[PDB]
Design a protein around this ligand. Structure first.
Ligand SMILES: [Cl-]
Ligand SMILES: [Cl-]
Ligand SMILES: [Cl-]
Ligand SMILES: [Cl-]
Lengths: 317, 317
């Protein structure tokens, strides 16, 4: 009766407005006095590095986040966030989860550690936005960029310096100067949250077509929920995912074409091919670490092979 | 329950299981004794020819359908269903509606005739599935196929003969030869509903990347709803749309590569480019017909032009 939840999202305040608040506001309107979810933004109740354990322990009831930034202690953590070159398209994320087995794997992994994986979804592609233009691979060398831990470990091979700072602190460090840029998002977020005002260039070669994140709930709180509220929560979370699917699909194209705050640059395809090749090596290193990681890597490899065989509009030649 | 709705969908029973039933079942579980929606499938309560009017006058409370097969008395009827070459990608539909102004046009057009447009969504691409192989444009000539009214008028220019029959009758009509084929769906539906069992070939060149359909409600029933149920319905409808986004994204690729009931054929691009060029002339014929059709055609043109400008993963050279 009149359940009180607190949810903390990975998103900063200006971003939470678009990626979590609408669905939480809708849930609250529908649920009324039965249940209310208070939404907190990046690092607000607890820092990122404490977020997973805060939810596990029950201090925070729910989380919207990728696995990677919060360093969940699971075998699938390295696949959340921006797994290099994993998904070309945002719709690949719900398909992988619902049709190629990733939902059952995430559920088992998180249940082991006292957490309910409610649902996964796609967000945006991962692009470099920077103060200085990137026109070759060597231009990546030395760059301090805000990114995710696993994508950052991959990017380090090209001389990139992956920096993690709290999200709310980024804008200024771009304006100057502990950061040279960002590899945390695509162009829709860049314009929306103000990062485009303090960077100058946008590299069109992404290192992922779609971020993977999720809604999680403390398992005890999850099993306490009445059926009707559990279903309501699940449906509002899917609505949140659906909204992001079209928000990003529309935003990336429109802002690339009509945005005047970032100048587009590109690295030639022949040159960028080295990055893609390196990512396959990186996948193999991950697969070697455990049987679960090997299983997931094989699913990504198989899926991408099947896209090539399916052809248009999944893949073109 | 206190509020009782009947919804009729365009989809036959075996199709409704996938494109409407899940979300309506969820709605009913969450709403309980407050409101229930009974879902009826193709032509059950009234024939397709009477569907719009039955909703307008309140015989039926709600409809899931495209504009075109229903022949709604609006200026946007010809854009529903399969508007030839309008949308390369399913996510183009919610983007056009939420970000390029189609939602407001549809709301207005339908309000004039006493119907609430709740939400638009994408379904599947439009492909030929036939008893005999199509490997050239000439192979289309004289083919009697089940399609949508507007797409059929377009295809008529290539000698296709559009035939209209009730959905539940299509399977037997294919078995007996009353139909040479279908151009009503993609491969996911073909396999799911049994049509693949009574046809032999699937043509890879589509004439639309995404069917446009909607949920509609009789305006009086809509205004009678308490706000919380209005919201619950809208959210469950968006969940229905989300489900279709990933159901078709996954199904089209998987069945093309792994299905065994239909043999793939292709028309060479140079040949098929004739069909794409013809479609642009078709759009111009539609624009000639009213100010609102001209407005909508221009939106489709601008959207597709900006897709080309944006580049990957929207368009590939
Ligand atoms: Cl949201
Ligand atoms: Cl999921
Ligand atoms: Cl559904
Ligand atoms: Cl809409």
């Amino acid at each position: 009766p009149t359940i009180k939840w607190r949810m903390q999202t990975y998103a900063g305040a200006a971003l939470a407005e678009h990626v979590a608040k609408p669905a939480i506001d809708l849930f609250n309107r529908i649920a009324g006095d039965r249940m209310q979810i208070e939404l907190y933004s990046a690092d607000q109740l607890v820092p990122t590095g404490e977020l997973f354990r805060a939810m596990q322990r029950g201090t925070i009831d729910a989380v919207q986040s990728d696995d990677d930034s919060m360093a969940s202690p699971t075998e699938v953590t390295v696949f959340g966030g921006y797994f290099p070159f994993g998904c070309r398209y945002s719709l690949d994320v719900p398909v992988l989860f619902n049709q190629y087995g990733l939902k059952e794997i995430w559920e088992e992994e998180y249940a082991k550690v006292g957490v309910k994986h409610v649902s996964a979804g796609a967000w945006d592609p991962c692009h470099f936005a920077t103060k200085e233009p990137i026109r070759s691979l060597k231009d990546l060398e030395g760059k301090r960029v805000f990114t995710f831990p696993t994508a950052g470990r991959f990017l380090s091979r090209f001389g990139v310096v992956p920096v993690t700072l709290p999200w709310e602190d980024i804008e200024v460090a771009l304006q100057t100067g502990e950061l040279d840029g960002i590899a945390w998002s695509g162009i829709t977020e860049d314009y929306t949250v103000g990062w485009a005002n303090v960077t100058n260039y946008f590299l069109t070669n992404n290192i992922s077509g779609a971020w993977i994140g999720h809604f999680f709930v403390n398992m005890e709180r999850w099993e306490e929920l009445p059926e009707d509220l559990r279903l309501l929560f699940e449906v509002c979370c899917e609505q949140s995912h659906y909204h992001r699917q079209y928000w990003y699909w529309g935003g990336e194209a429109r802002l690339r074409v009509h945005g005047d705050k970032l100048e587009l640059t590109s690295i030639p395809d022949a040159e960028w091919d080295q990055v893609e090749t390196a990512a396959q090596e990186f996948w193999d290193e991950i697969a070697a670490q455990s049987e679960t990681k090997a299983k997931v890597v094989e699913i990504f490899k198989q899926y991408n092979a099947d896209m090539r065989k399916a052809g248009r509009p999944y893949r073109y030649v």
